[PDB]
Amino acid sequence: AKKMIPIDDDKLIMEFKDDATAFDGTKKARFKGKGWLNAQLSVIFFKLLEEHGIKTHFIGVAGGNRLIVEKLDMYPLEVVVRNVVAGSLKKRLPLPEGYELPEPIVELYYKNDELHDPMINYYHAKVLGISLDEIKKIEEIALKVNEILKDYLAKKGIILVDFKLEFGKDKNGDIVLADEISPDTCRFWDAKTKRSLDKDVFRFDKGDLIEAYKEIYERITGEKPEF
Amino acid sequence: AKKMIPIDDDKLIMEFKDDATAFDGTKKARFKGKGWLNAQLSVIFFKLLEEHGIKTHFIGVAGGNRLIVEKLDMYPLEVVVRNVVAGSLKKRLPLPEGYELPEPIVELYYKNDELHDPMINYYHAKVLGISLDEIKKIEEIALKVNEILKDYLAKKGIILVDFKLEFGKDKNGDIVLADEISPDTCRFWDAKTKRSLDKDVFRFDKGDLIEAYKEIYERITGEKP
Ligand SMILES: Nc1ncnc2c1ncn2[C@@H]1O[C@H](COP(=O)(O)OP(=O)(O)O)[C@@H](O)[C@H]1O
Ligand SMILES: Nc1ncnc2c1ncn2[C@@H]1O[C@H](COP(=O)(O)O)[C@@H](O)[C@H]1O
Numbered sequence: 079a080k081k082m083i084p085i086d087d088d089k090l091i092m093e094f095k096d097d098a099t100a101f102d103g104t105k106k107a108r109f110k111g112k113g114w115l116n117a118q119l120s121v122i123f124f125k126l127l128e129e130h131g132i133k134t135h136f137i138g139v140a141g142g143n144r145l146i147v148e149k150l151d152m153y154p155l156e157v158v159v160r161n162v163v164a165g166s167l168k169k170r171l172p173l174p175e176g177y178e179l180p181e182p183i184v185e186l187y188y189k190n191d192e193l194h195d196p197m198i199n200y201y202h203a204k205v206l207g208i209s210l211d212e213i214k215k216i217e218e219i220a221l222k223v224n225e226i227l228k229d230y231l232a233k234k235g236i237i238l239v240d241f242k243l244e245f246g247k248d249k250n251g252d253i254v255l256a257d258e259i260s261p262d263t264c265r266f267w268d269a270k271t272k273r274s275l276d277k278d279v280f281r282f283d284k285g286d287l288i289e290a291y292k293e294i295y296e297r298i299t300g301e302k303p304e305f
Numbered sequence: 306a307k308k309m310i311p312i313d314d315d316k317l318i319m320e321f322k323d324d325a326t327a328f329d330g331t332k333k334a335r336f337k338g339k340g341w342l343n344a345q346l347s348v349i350f351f352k353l354l355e356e357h358g359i360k361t362h363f364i365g366v367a368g369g370n371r372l373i374v375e376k377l378d379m380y381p382l383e384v385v386v387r388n389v390v391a392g393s394l395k396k397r398l399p400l401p402e403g404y405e406l407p408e409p410i411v412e413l414y415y416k417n418d419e420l421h422d423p424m425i426n427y428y429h430a431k432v433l434g435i436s437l438d439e440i441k442k443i444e445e446i447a448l449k450v451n452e453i454l455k456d457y458l459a460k461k462g463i464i465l466v467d468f469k470l471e472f473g474k475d476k477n478g479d480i481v482l483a484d485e486i487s488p489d490t491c492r493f494w495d496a497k498t499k500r501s502l503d504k505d506v507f508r509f510d511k512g513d514l515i516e517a518y519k520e521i522y523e524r525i526t527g528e529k530p
């Protein structure tokens with residue numbers, strides 16, 4: 079759903095596509111305007127985080143669906159933060175869908191398609207060459223990011239249920255937030271109705287995807303989207 | 306603005322009054338219903354915090370403006386948490402009123418009327434007989450309390466600008482949140498207009514106090530007082 083176009087040693091173009099994929103590509107569709115929506119939401123979120131002192135890969139915009147981002151040496155991780163029980167957490171804790179967690183939960187996943195992104199702990203992370211000190215910094219940033227996004231969205235009647243982040247190292251060795259932040263990579267629920275406003279609408283045919291993504295955008299910006 | 310009526314060794318009654326005082330009692334007024342509103346908001350906040358595992362002195366209600374609280378050995382502190390630049394923080398940081406802080410700020414003040422509650426640090430605290438370990442627990446609780454109150458109020462279009470907390474020790478030596486939590490001890494701004502919905506309305510004659518306090522109550526409860 080993204081194309082990464084290299085510019086040079088320190089920069090690249092992240093291009094968002096209208097393609098939607100789920101269940102290892104066994105389920106596919108195209109949603110006109112999805113890419114535009116995901117790119118724009120990523121811009122909103124990254125700038126918001128930058129305002130709070132979070133270091134992100136975001137440099138600028140190069141078109142409706144194209145972002146310019148700094149090239150990073152990526153950690154082979156998906157860093158998942160969870161505020162409300164949903165998806166795979168139901169397989170892990172004896173709690174129902176929708177349960178509000180007393181504190182946010184951080185899960186680490188080894189980014190590996192062949193092993194289907196298995197969950198790992200700090201010991202596994204060391205074997206994969208990630209020091210405990212780096213892990214602690216990563217989780218700390220992820221939790222800060224969580225609070226900013228959660229609070230921002232909560233004021234707009236949107237529950238940040240959970241989300242995945244990715245991180246990399248820049249030239250100076252600092253840990254930098256990367257990839258995307260969109261309804262493709264977050265679970266967003268309406269505060270009142272608890273309906274999904276994210277990729278789960280596609281994954282489980284719970285409704286109209288472009289409709290859901292437009293809803294997020296309009297609530298955040300105060301404006302209907304024009305792709 | 307409160308009367309503390311002792312019951313026995315472990316309990317007391319905190320009575321909220323309609324009296325309002327500012328600038329060392331050089332400015333005084335009475336606001337019909339203020340005490341009731343402060344007592345009720347204190348109940349709402351303490352119960353909210355108790356729900357999240359915060360230990361508080363709140364036991365129960367003994368009338369519209371009377372709370373039953375557990376008696377504590379008080380720390381001689383005001384513990385102030387700040388999310389948004391206002392009041393005395395403007396004298397300390399080169400930042401305008403309304404500036405949103407990247408992270409919450411915790412300030413300690415020594416509770417002493419004659420010295421007009423001066424700001425202190427961890428070294429001064431130790432002299433006043435408060436260990437660094439206690440201080441760290443205090444600030445940790447204060448930051449937890451901040452996050453719950455801020456998030457709760459934000460969903461209701463209210464900015465938690467800053468607020469004062471007080472703490473004491475119970476019989477078992479645990480650190481327990483005490484005093485009150487009300488528009489007398491917090492700065493609350495309307496999210497859209499940024500107008501004060503707290504004691505600043507009285508302090509600086511920015512409007513109608515009872516109006517501002519009723520507004521807070523109605524937004525929280527969904528009911529007119
Ligand atoms: N649970 C408690 N146990 C003992 N003292 C308390 C408790 N809660 C509050 N206090 C103290 O009771 C007093 C009530 O506040 P207030 O009437 O405004 O007094 P003051 O104006 O001197 O701060 C304060 O001195 C406060 O520190
Ligand atoms: N490979 C991935 N791509 C995009 N988002 C993901 C990925 N893995 C997990 N997430 C997000 O992380 C959260 C938790 O997913 P799950 O573990 O399936 O419950 C959800 O918001 C997902 O959208």
Ligand SMILES: Nc1ncnc2c1ncn2[C@@H]1O[C@H](COP(=O)(O)O)[C@@H](O)[C@H]1O
Pocket residue numbers: 079080081082135147148149150151152244246256257258
């Ligand atoms: N700043 C970055 N530098 C280098 N690689 C990145 C950066 N941000 C994201 N990526 C990777 O680019 C790929 C694009 O995601 P996908 O659309 O799943 O192919 C993923 O492998 C990401 O880990």
Ligand SMILES: Nc1ncnc2c1ncn2[C@@H]1O[C@H](COP(=O)(O)O)[C@@H](O)[C@H]1O
Pocket residue numbers: 383385391392393394422467468469489490491492
């Ligand atoms: N002695 C006090 N009595 C009541 N509230 C206070 C006191 N000191 C500080 N506060 C509260 O803590 C915050 C910071 O106050 P200041 O340092 O006066 O700007 C404000 O919300 C005040 O209402």
